[PDB]
Amino acid sequence: TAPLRVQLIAKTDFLAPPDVPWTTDADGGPALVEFAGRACYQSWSTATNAGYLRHIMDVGHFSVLEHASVSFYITGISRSCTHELIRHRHFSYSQLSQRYVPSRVVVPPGMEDDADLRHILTEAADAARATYSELLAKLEARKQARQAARAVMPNATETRIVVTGNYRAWRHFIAMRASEHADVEIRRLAIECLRQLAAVAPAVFADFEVTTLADGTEVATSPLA
Amino acid sequence: ETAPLRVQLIAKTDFLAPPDVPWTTDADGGPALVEFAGRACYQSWSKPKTATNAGYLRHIMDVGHFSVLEHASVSFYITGISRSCTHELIRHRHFSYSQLSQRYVPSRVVVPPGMEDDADLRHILTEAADAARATYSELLAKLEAKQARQAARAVMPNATETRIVVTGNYRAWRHFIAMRASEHADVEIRRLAIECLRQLAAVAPAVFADFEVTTLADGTEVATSP
Amino acid sequence: TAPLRVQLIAKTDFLAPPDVPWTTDADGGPALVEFAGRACYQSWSKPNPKTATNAGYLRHIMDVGHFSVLEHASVSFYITGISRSCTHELIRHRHFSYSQLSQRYRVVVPPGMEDDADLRHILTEAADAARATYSELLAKLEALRRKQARQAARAVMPNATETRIVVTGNYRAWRHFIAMRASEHADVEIRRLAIECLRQLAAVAPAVFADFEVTTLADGTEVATS
Amino acid sequence: AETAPLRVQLIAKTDFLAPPDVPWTTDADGGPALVEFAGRACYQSWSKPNPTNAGYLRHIMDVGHFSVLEHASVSFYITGISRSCTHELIRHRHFSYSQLSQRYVPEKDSRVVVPPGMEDDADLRHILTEAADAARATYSELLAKLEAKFADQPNAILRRKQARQAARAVMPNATETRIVVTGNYRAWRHFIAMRASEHADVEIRRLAIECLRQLAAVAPAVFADFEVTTLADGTEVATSPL
Ligand SMILES: NC(=O)c1ccc[n+]([C@@H]2O[C@H](COP(=O)([O-])OP(=O)(O)OC[C@H]3O[C@@H](n4cnc5c(N)ncnc54)[C@H](OP(=O)(O)O)[C@@H]3O)[C@@H](O)[C@H]2O)c1
Ligand SMILES: NC(=O)c1ccc[n+]([C@@H]2O[C@H](COP(=O)([O-])OP(=O)(O)OC[C@H]3O[C@@H](n4cnc5c(N)ncnc54)[C@H](OP(=O)(O)O)[C@@H]3O)[C@@H](O)[C@H]2O)c1
Ligand SMILES: NC(=O)c1ccc[n+]([C@@H]2O[C@H](COP(=O)([O-])OP(=O)(O)OC[C@H]3O[C@@H](n4cnc5c(N)ncnc54)[C@H](OP(=O)(O)O)[C@@H]3O)[C@@H](O)[C@H]2O)c1
Numbered sequence A: 001t002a003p004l005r006v007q008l009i010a011k012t013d014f015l016a017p018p019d020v021p022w023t024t025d026a027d028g029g030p031a032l033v034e035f036a037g038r039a040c041y042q043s044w045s046t047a048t049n050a051g052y053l054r055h056i057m058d059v060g061h062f063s064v065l066e067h068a069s070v071s072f073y074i075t076g077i078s079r080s081c082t083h084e085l086i087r088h089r090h091f092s093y094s095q096l097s098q099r100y101v102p103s104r105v106v107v108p109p110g111m112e113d114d115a116d117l118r119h120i121l122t123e124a125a126d127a128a129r130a131t132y133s134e135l136l137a138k139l140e141a142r143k144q145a146r147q148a149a150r151a152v153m154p155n156a157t158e159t160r161i162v163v164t165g166n167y168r169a170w171r172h173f174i175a176m177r178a179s180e181h182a183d184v185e186i187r188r189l190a191i192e193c194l195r196q197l198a199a200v201a202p203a204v205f206a207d208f209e210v211t212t213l214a215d216g217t218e219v220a221t222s223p224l225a
Numbered sequence B: 001e002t003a004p005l006r007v008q009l010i011a012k013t014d015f016l017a018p019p020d021v022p023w024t025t026d027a028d029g030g031p032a033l034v035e036f037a038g039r040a041c042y043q044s045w046s047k048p049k050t051a052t053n054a055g056y057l058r059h060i061m062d063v064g065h066f067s068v069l070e071h072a073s074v075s076f077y078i079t080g081i082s083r084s085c086t087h088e089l090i091r092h093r094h095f096s097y098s099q100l101s102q103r104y105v106p107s108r109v110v111v112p113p114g115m116e117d118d119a120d121l122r123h124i125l126t127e128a129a130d131a132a133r134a135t136y137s138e139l140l141a142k143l144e145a146k147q148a149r150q151a152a153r154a155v156m157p158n159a160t161e162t163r164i165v166v167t168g169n170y171r172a173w174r175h176f177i178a179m180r181a182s183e184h185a186d187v188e189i190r191r192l193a194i195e196c197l198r199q200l201a202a203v204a205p206a207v208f209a210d211f212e213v214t215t216l217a218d219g220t221e222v223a224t225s226p
Numbered sequence C: 001t002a003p004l005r006v007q008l009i010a011k012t013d014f015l016a017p018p019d020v021p022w023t024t025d026a027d028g029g030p031a032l033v034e035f036a037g038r039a040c041y042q043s044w045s046k047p048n049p050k051t052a053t054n055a056g057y058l059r060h061i062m063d064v065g066h067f068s069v070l071e072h073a074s075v076s077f078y079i080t081g082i083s084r085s086c087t088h089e090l091i092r093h094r095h096f097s098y099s100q101l102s103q104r105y106r107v108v109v110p111p112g113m114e115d116d117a118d119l120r121h122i123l124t125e126a127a128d129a130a131r132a133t134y135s136e137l138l139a140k141l142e143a144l145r146r147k148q149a150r151q152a153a154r155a156v157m158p159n160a161t162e163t164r165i166v167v168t169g170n171y172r173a174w175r176h177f178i179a180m181r182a183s184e185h186a187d188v189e190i191r192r193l194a195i196e197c198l199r200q201l202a203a204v205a206p207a208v209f210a211d212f213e214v215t216t217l218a219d220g221t222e223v224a225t226s
Numbered sequence D: 001a002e003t004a005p006l007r008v009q010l011i012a013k014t015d016f017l018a019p020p021d022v023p024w025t026t027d028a029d030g031g032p033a034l035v036e037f038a039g040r041a042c043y044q045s046w047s048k049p050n051p052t053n054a055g056y057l058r059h060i061m062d063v064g065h066f067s068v069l070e071h072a073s074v075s076f077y078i079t080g081i082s083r084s085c086t087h088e089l090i091r092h093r094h095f096s097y098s099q100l101s102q103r104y105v106p107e108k109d110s111r112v113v114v115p116p117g118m119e120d121d122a123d124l125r126h127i128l129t130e131a132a133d134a135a136r137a138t139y140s141e142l143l144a145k146l147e148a149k150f151a152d153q154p155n156a157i158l159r160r161k162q163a164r165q166a167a168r169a170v171m172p173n174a175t176e177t178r179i180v181v182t183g184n185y186r187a188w189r190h191f192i193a194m195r196a197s198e199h200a201d202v203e204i205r206r207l208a209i210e211c212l213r214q215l216a217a218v219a220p221a222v223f224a225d226f227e228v229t230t231l232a233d234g235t236e237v238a239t240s241p242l
């Protein structure tokens, strides 16, 4: 079995143009966003970065968020969870090839509780791999064949993925997938991205707050989204 | 228990020429709209080497004006496609999709193309699917003793049939075919691409007839365009 | 001078699949949209009375925020009597396809000036002078590839110069354009364009565009909001 | 009137933070290192046959896995670009833009961008700046008249904005604008392919050649396949076999 890991692997380096009479108390993506917004009116003379970013989002000028981007390397995510994930446009993805073969399985969050459920699951995964080898043997009598014999692998099979999005795309991913209407695995992932995103871009994600349900899981909601 | 691939064309363009523009052409529908949009850039309504619709469309493409193709679109309803093939399919930007919900439970499996002529493999596959389903019901019962179903769904194989409405403009279809109807493409997605092509060539020959379909010695078809 | 004209030139042609056990009291885009939404759950029999009409189903789709299903249907307009600066603001919207009157090829009067003959005459005279300048530059610049001259000479043409455009989008993209551009915060020319598109869209797809209400302001200009 | 030269400033690029737990290192940082990491993550190919970042990137290009290039991005602040050239630029999707507001009118004098084909001719340049001055004069005449005509209408703040919006109807194509443009490597490669060619008009061709210069510096392997050649007219073009 494999646990969810979300690692932040890239963010924006910001290099302020020396000839613009403007400065700010921020660096990186948060600084770039303010610069871009101010560029629209050449308003170089909401006087803190935080307050400027707060204002931008109140006034609904969200396109300025698109200039700054963040990438994560995500492991311990199920095939079915990634299928939901890649439905989002305005992200770029690089995913582990289906042709690749180590059985690593991701336990659904509702089942992580239980030894019997967990055992039923890994057993089923072992049975699938056994079938995979049987299908491959008879089939090859070659590289595409390998991919095609993975017809038998379960939804819970682990995959790994590099995801990159601008701040605007991340905020929409979190608004959609960290709600009660989303399944628990992608919601779990969405809350973990938000956590890491707030560490690098607090001002950008300040409007999201996390509510821990009685049900046990966490949800994220914003008045702007 | 096994579901064959079926691709059904469900939508295309209804073109309505504006009366106030001094132009007609030997075409209707999507191909007529594409010519209209191309002509709009220069107001070349009165049109002599590109004065037919098919000639005009070929020229647009020869000269690399592919954005004019974006105005016309086609939708398919696709059944008998594996969950795993659809995962490859939805990596394509510039399409719109509506997919059979994860939370749907009929067991129906799609046979990988290279396993279709093999009775032994067909049987190993369908028995596998029966075992996964048995396991689904065992997990689900024990889990209850929406979320429970989402959790039990963890054991369902990649070969499980899904169903999808896919909508794309001609430019998007042309790129999908180029990419997915080649040698290097996975067999299930390649078969889908050649089926889509066949039907697209039927409704809009001037846009899609530049694709040459050839059979490989292995039995599968490939499409290539100059 | 050139007045605004918006002509609907293309819309979706829907072909229901005969092998699917479903009909609806609509056709074209609204029918395609309903089919796509229903395909997600295979809800072909229409068990719910509230959504057993096309309008009812579409209303529910949007209440429930399933806006991605609107992406399947599209509408194209041909737009004339639109200034260069207004089209610049239009083409900022992504998820649209455009074909615009070429740069290698009449003024539109600002709506707040339309009733004032003195103001209109100041503008047309300025446009006349600019056009004189363009001719003087064009001649001096020429003194095939000698279309480099026209590219350079256009430097003097004003914002108010008319352009022409074919715009295609799906219903989801149109709804967003209207919501952003039909509000008071947008300048009057793009707002006027958004309201006219809304009118024509609500005529073809009422259930999809009904929630937009058009109100009039104190200057005799219109706004729309959902 | 005053004339603005083209200035393209790189204001942002990718910062790459290697995950400590992955058994891999490379001889690069930033965007190029991220692209390699993402390409290797597809196959978990952390260890090498053995005996460079630039070699891996060429491999990625040569196998046509261009989607891996989408992970790294660069942003430029561009000034001294005409409103017409920016109209052409923003047609490109897969970029994000923030542009000087259509409203903005420079307080001190008109700023215009001379078409490159006119750069070497004092008479042509004078006709253009004279035209630009006459448009500004018309602008101020229209604005004052509009503000007068709107004197009794409600919301005087709104009326000022609307007066400005209508009056700018006369401003020419050559008017200077400024823009922040952000794209991933894949989007930049296509912008260069399309706009650094013979077909492209000279003002946008100039811009694309300059973006290329600065892109080639930050990521040489990603942009190496483009070759710049000068035409008989003294103008540069970039082509790639890819
Ligand atoms: N191991 C895996 O399973 C794996 C992992 C990662 C990626 N992938 C691949 O990713 C592919 C997606 O297909 P595709 O990208 O060729 O075509 P696509 O998504 O259909 O998009 C068509 C074209 O639009 C452009 N484009 C789309 N999104 C862009 C973006 N975000 N930034 C810059 N340009 C963008 C590219 O054009 P131009 O470059 O010509 O301008 C692209 O060729 C799949 O075929 C899949 O094979 C696979
Ligand atoms: N079985 C199912 O439950 C099922 C089936 C199919 C799809 N889906 C849903 O599809 C969703 C994908 O997310 P999403 O589309 O909200 O956000 P998204 O893909 O992350 O895209 C972000 C935004 O870009 C705009 N957009 C993207 N592509 C567009 C297009 N082709 N035409 C017009 N506008 C476009 C929309 O903005 P605006 O509209 O605000 O302008 C959208 O909200 C998932 O949330 C998933 O739940 C579910
Ligand atoms: N007369 C005029 O002034 C005029 C009028 C209209 C348009 N245009 C032209 O339109 C061009 C836009 O550039 P471009 O589209 O080639 O590159 P682009 O916008 O930079 O997009 C890059 C690639 O993404 C794909 N793509 C983007 N949006 C798409 C969509 N809606 N549907 C299908 N594919 C899409 C295409 O790839 P693939 O096809 O390879 O899959 C395209 O080559 C401008 O360069 C301009 O010259 C000019």
Ligand SMILES: NC(=O)c1ccc[n+]([C@@H]2O[C@H](COP(=O)([O-])OP(=O)(O)OC[C@H]3O[C@@H](n4cnc5c(N)ncnc54)[C@H](OP(=O)(O)O)[C@@H]3O)[C@@H](O)[C@H]2O)c1
Residues within 6 Å of the ligand: A040, A062, A063, A066, A090, A166, A168, A169, A172, C092, C093, C094, C095, C176, C177, C180, D095, D096, D097, D098, D099, D100, D101, D102
């Ligand atoms: N000086 C100026 O006034 C100035 C300068 C530059 C730009 N702009 C603005 O840029 C605007 C463009 O409109 P728009 O972006 O609202 O809608 P859009 O281009 O029509 O696209 C529709 C939706 O798709 C999503 N989207 C599109 N491209 C995206 C991307 N690259 N990254 C992440 N998400 C993306 C956003 O949805 P979600 O956030 O809901 O997910 C957006 O609301 C214009 O309205 C203009 O006001 C203004």
Ligand SMILES: [K+]
Residues within 6 Å of the ligand: A090, A168, A169, A172
């Ligand atoms: K977004």
Ligand SMILES: [K+]
Residues within 6 Å of the ligand: B094, B171, B172, B175
């Ligand atoms: K495409």
Ligand SMILES: [K+]
Residues within 6 Å of the ligand: C095, C172, C173, C176
């Ligand atoms: K949209």
Ligand SMILES: [K+]
Residues within 6 Å of the ligand: D094, D186, D187, D190
């Ligand atoms: K691109």
